Amino acid sequence: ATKSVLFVCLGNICRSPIAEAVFRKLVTDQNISENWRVDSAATSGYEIGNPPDYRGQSCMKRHGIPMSHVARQITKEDFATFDYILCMDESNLRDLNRKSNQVKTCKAKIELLGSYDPQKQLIIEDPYYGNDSDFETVYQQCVRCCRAFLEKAH
Ligand SMILES: O=C(Nc1nc2ccccc2s1)[C@H](c1ccccc1)S(=O)(=O)O
């Protein structure tokens, strides 16, 4: 409602829907989900319409955080409506900045989600060709960064 955040990755089937679900849980547990619009989107069109990769679901189920999303690509409107667009890596950041320069209204602050990590792990690497441990690392990064971002936005 008041505040809004859009998490962004390459496909919007793993890193960003995980961040979105982690963040939504955090605000729900703190009684303030009503004050937040939370969403996720992709820089690419590779996965439009698809659900989160089941490898990410396996990880999320272990941690007891339900995750549901239909992959969608970032749009021009997103720059106008979101307070924060938080992405995973330097390619995402570059692509988002490119798209932001094509619109009249950019309300969004566009940043690396990892810039909020107290442990300074700046990049949330694509685990597509990784193993279970890589998905777990992404999850842990999302938890740390989402907590810090909620605490105090840049
Ligand atoms: O979409 C993803 N990676 C992609 N890798 C390729 C490689 C070749 C062609 C298209 C793509 S999209 C990532 C991801 C997706 C699923 C599982 C883990 C990570 S995501 O960005 O975290 O969703």
Side-chain angles (χ1 to χ4, degrees):
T2 292
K3 295 181 177 61
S4 54
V5 56
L6 177 70
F7 298 96
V8 171
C9 63
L10 175 65
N12 188 218
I13 62 164
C14 181
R15 289 168 291 170
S16 61
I18 285 171
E20 179 201 347
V22 167
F23 187 86
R24 183 173 293 109
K25 177 174 182 300
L26 290 180
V27 294
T28 301
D29 288 345
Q30 285 181 29
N31 307 324
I32 55 170
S33 66
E34 299 83 359
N35 301 131
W36 279 92
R37 172 191 181 209
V38 188
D39 194 16
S40 62
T43 61
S44 84
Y46 274 112
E47 286 292 325
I48 296 172
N50 291 340
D53 195 276
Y54 197 81
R55 290 181 287 159
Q57 290 286 13
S58 292
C59 174
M60 293 288 271
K61 289 183 176 187
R62 254 214 315 292
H63 292 287
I65 309 189
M67 176 171 62
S68 176
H69 191 70
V70 177
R72 72 170 185 87
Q73 187 167 19
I74 183 113
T75 65
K76 289 185 171 189
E77 188 174 16
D78 288 323
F79 298 98
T81 64
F82 281 97
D83 297 319
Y84 287 92
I85 296 170
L86 302 181
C87 66
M88 306 299 155
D89 62 41
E90 313 96 315
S91 299
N92 301 155
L93 186 65
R94 179 200 64 226
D95 287 348
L96 287 168
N97 288 327
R98 179 184 64 82
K99 284 162 177 164
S100 82
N101 285 322
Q102 298 177 341
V103 309
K104 182 177 178 178
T105 302
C106 190
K107 183 175 68 169
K109 184 168 178 46
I110 304 163
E111 307 182 272
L112 293 171
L113 179 54
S115 76
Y116 289 92
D117 187 9
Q119 298 189 13
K120 305 301 181 181
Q121 301 307 308
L122 184 66
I123 305 305
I124 302 173
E125 302 285 4
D126 186 348
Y128 185 77
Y129 283 117
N131 60 34
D132 288 323
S133 70
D134 294 315
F135 286 80
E136 174 70 7
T137 291
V138 165
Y139 169 83
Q140 294 297 339
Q141 290 182 279
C142 285
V143 172
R144 300 197 307 272
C145 297
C146 284
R147 181 179 297 133
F149 165 70
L150 182 58
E151 238 282 295
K152 170 87 177 312
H154 292 149

